[PDB]
Request: fold
Amino acid sequence: ADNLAEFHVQNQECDSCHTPDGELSNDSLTYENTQCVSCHGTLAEVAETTKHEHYNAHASHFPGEVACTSCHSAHEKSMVYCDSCHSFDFNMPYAKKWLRDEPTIAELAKDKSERQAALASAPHDTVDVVVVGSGGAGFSAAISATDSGAKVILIEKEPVIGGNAKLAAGGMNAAWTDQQKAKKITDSPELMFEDTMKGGQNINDPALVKVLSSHSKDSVDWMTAMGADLTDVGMMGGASVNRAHRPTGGAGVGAHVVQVLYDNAVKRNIDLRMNTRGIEVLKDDKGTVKGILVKGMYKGYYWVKADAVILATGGFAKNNERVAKLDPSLKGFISTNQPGAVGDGLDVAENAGGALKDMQYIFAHPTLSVKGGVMVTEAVRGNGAILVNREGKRFVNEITTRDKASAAILAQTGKSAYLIFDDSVRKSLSKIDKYIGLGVAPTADSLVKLGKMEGIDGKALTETVARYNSLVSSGKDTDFERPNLPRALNEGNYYAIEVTPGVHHTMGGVMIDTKAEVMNAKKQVIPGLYGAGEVTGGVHGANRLGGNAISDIITFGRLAGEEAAKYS
Ligand SMILES: Cc1cc2nc3c(=O)[nH]c(=O)nc-3n(C[C@H](O)[C@H](O)[C@H](O)COP(=O)(O)OP(=O)(O)OC[C@H]3O[C@@H](n4cnc5c(N)ncnc54)[C@H](O)[C@@H]3O)c2cc1C
Ligand code: HEM
Ligand code: HEM
Ligand code: HEM
Ligand code: HEM
Ligand SMILES: O=C(O)/C=C/C(=O)O
Ligand code: NA
Reply:
């Protein structure tokens, strides 16, 4: 057979997969996927038949209920979503190579006739609020608005939920929590505010940073009440004390928080539509929001009538052409992001009248794995790892801020460096076991043996670790002034991870006020239009601090949902 439907129709009727009238159930293909599951079993049952020692297409780190049609189309060949970041050895029936080819919002002007027909029709649905994007900001705003009394529709352009938030590792910053008190830490919302303004070179909007620090404990309390575990508290650069919260043992904060938000949306019966892209905000004759035009992958263009629209579409760090226009030094670099993080949400905001700010400030994460092409969290360094070059020596403060770590790594022999750690560091952060499972953390019982494996001067490496352990013991790093020295590297075996920089977060974006209301260039509010998360500018300023982005999306996402509900 040439395709999957042709294969099944050799011994099955069309209604084995389709509804009685033959029409597609909706853009999420809910009915059709239910039939795949009735015969083959759930994703977890299918995964028992496709095991590999260290990977499995049907059992991954993605949260929520991943639909079979995310990767298996029926009437045409299709792509494996995992190939957008990894290169595993797979053999999916009727596959084709991964290629992302999505028209820009400007290119969709080509569909004038279909768009005009949709807008002349009655609205397909009439609700109070529409939320655009299924990352942390978007789920937070849909749950908040629903709990306040509003009827919502939440849309997502990709086949799977969670955006870049499902990948988060290091933690969520907050201050003066009960979680901190149980680990004997002393902090305050005022210290969190001060660290954040210094971190962004005092370019941040102080009104927005006051919302970020003052609502942080409440945001941790809200997530925990919905079922989250945010009890492990670690350190990341730029923080005066430990304040990055994550699940017990040091697991990743992102897949866990997105799973808790999805389960709470399902409990509240929130209308969630996959494969549905927001295209154009609609306004009445007085310039206030009246609804939004969307494009369903399977059902076509239609529009939804509503009092408010909340844009929660994330950043543009995967779009290297747009990145290079703003910062030529980043042209050609790899990215840490999901395939759809390209900035189409900003284009929708701008067409509606919103102004942008701080677009030139773009962060390249210093440590992506050379072998695996994926981010290695700053928490590996925060829990104690060091960085060495091919000469076997230290060369930078590993928890330094701004762009100092990426610049220092690019200046070393080969334009890359190595993270070095032991079994005490490994046992302190469970996320490290995920890098060992991927095959990117070679190990040996001595530093001389490990250097011989990876091309690092082994005798100099041994001396370098002995010296660093001496500075940990005395309590001061006189070589590079690293301000936190949590453990000596001296238990069990040693590990190395080869790293280099990659494009990661866009700190600029749409202008918002303290109520998450979008504004134009004259600072006038556009009634009914809201923005929250990485699509906004002004929270982080000229440089970001690790752990502040997840704090931002929960706080500003919940706030926008409450405000849009009251406005409606
Ligand atoms: C690998 C990785 C690890 C990270 N780790 C951390 C961490 O530990 N701590 C931290 O503070 N930050 C971390 N960050 C940053 C933080 O996760 C992001 O800034 C956060 O994902 C922003 O969330 P958001 O809700 O604004 O957007 P996202 O989570 O990116 O979600 C946006 C969603 O909107 C959808 N969308 C876009 N345009 C449209 C459209 N037109 N119509 C419909 N849907 C659309 C997208 O497809 C996407 O699913 C990390 C980032 C990455 C990439
Ligand atoms: C989109 C919906 C479905 C998906 C994604 C799916 C998935 C698959 C795949 C990938 C194969 C292997 C093809 C090959 O070897 O070339 C397969 C085969 C098969 N499918 Fe499906 N399927 C779907 C619907 C169904 C339904 C509704 C039924 C039963 C009525 C069914 C029964 C079978 C059977 C019997 C086989 C052959 C092997 C076996 O005995 O399991 N499938 N399916
Ligand atoms: C001769 C038998 C079939 C007929 C006439 C038929 C008809 C159609 C039509 C007309 C569409 C497109 C609808 C639109 O664009 O609005 C479609 C899509 C689809 N059909 Fe079928 N179908 C048949 C068999 C199957 C089988 C056996 C399966 C599953 C194994 C299946 C699953 C799907 C799915 C998942 C879609 C969405 C798009 C895609 O994945 O290709 N159909 N079908
Ligand atoms: C309940 C949901 C799904 C069903 C029922 C389904 C069905 C199947 C079946 C029947 C096979 C062939 C297995 C064999 O007999 O060897 C298969 C293979 C495969 N499917 Fe799925 N699939 C589902 C979801 C997905 C998703 C969401 C993805 C990607 C994220 C995916 C990617 C693959 C790949 C990559 C293979 C080949 C695996 C390998 O070579 O180890 N499938 N699927
Ligand atoms: C269903 C699709 C995918 C599968 C089956 C898969 C599989 C894996 C596996 C086997 C690992 C090693 C650790 C573990 O066992 O969990 C891993 C790690 C990782 N993957 Fe994926 N992957 C998928 C999609 C993606 C995509 C699309 C991205 C990026 C947008 C991504 C980013 C990462 C990262 C950053 C890690 C490092 C460890 C961590 O942060 O937990 N993966 N993946
Ligand atoms: O885990 C990380 O290093 C990413 C942190 C962040 O972007 O805040
Ligand atoms: Na931003």
